[PDB]
Amino acid sequence: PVETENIARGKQASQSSTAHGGAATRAVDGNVDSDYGHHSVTHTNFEDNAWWQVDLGKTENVGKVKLYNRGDGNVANRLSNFDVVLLNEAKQEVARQHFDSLNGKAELEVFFTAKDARYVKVELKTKNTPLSLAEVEVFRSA
Numbered sequence: 001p002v003e004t005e006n007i008a009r010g011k012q013a014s015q016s017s018t019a020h021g022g023a024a025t026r027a028v029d030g031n032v033d034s035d036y037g038h039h040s041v042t043h044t045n046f047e048d049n050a051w052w053q054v055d056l057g058k059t060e061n062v063g064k065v066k067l068y069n070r071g072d073g074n075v076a077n078r079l080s081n082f083d084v085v086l087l088n089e090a091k092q093e094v095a096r097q098h099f100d101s102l103n104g105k106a107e108l109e110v111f112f113t114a115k116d117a118r119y120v121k122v123e124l125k126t127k128n129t130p131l132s133l134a135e136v137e138v139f140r141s142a
């Protein structure tokens with residue numbers, strides 16, 4: 001059971017590197033359009049263990065994180081073998097779930113057991129692969 005407000009919208013975001021103009025803030029702009037050409041999808045360099053993070057600004061009790069994958073270019077696969085991690089205000093892990101793939105689905109809903117965290121991080125565990133997210137939405141436990 002989760003609230004409906006997406007508390008990641010408009011928050012500070014960052015990522016391991018930036019390529020092709022794909023600013024980290026594109027995953028928290030309020031627009032889940034998955035076509036990279038419509039400018040709302042992030043992109044890091046091709047690198048090992050690429051990551052992306054949003055700072056919620058305060059510790060919140062997180063119940064759901066929703067990832068929206070890139071959809072154009074036949075490169076949706078790059079979002080595979082990754083972790084979704086929640087960190088506290090000291091940047092220590094308070095929760096971690098691993099996923100092998102989204103299975104062609106355009107989105108992934110990740111549920112957390114009422115976890116108090118300030119940061120939400122997506123981490124690829126693959127070599128030489130860029131991280132691109134169309135949007136990451138985060139909802140409080142109800």
Ligand SMILES: CC(=O)N[C@@H]1[C@@H](O[C@@H]2O[C@H](CO)[C@H](O)[C@H](O)[C@H]2O[C@@H]2O[C@@H](C)[C@@H](O)[C@@H](O)[C@@H]2O)[C@H](O[C@@H]2O[C@@H](C)[C@@H](O)[C@@H](O)[C@@H]2O)[C@@H](CO)O[C@H]1O
Pocket residue numbers: 020036037038072073075
């Ligand atoms: C190979 C590469 O990175 N080329 C860049 C380019 O992106 C490619 O553009 C073509 C059409 O010309 C296709 O849409 C390809 O799918 C696309 O390559 C994909 O997307 C890029 C961003 C990378 O992730 C890449 O590895 C991948 O295969 C890019 O073109 C722009 O962005 C694309 C998606 C598209 O909307 C274009 O029409 C657009 O102008 C350009 C300019 O940003 O940069 C190239 O280096």
Ligand SMILES: [Ca+2]
Pocket residue numbers: 026027028029030031032033040041134135
């Ligand atoms: Ca977006």
Ligand SMILES: [Mg+2]
Pocket residue numbers: 035037038
């Ligand atoms: Mg278009």
Ligand SMILES: [Mg+2]
Pocket residue numbers: 037038039
């Ligand atoms: Mg344009």
Ligand SMILES: [Mg+2]
Pocket residue numbers: 012055
């Ligand atoms: Mg910060």
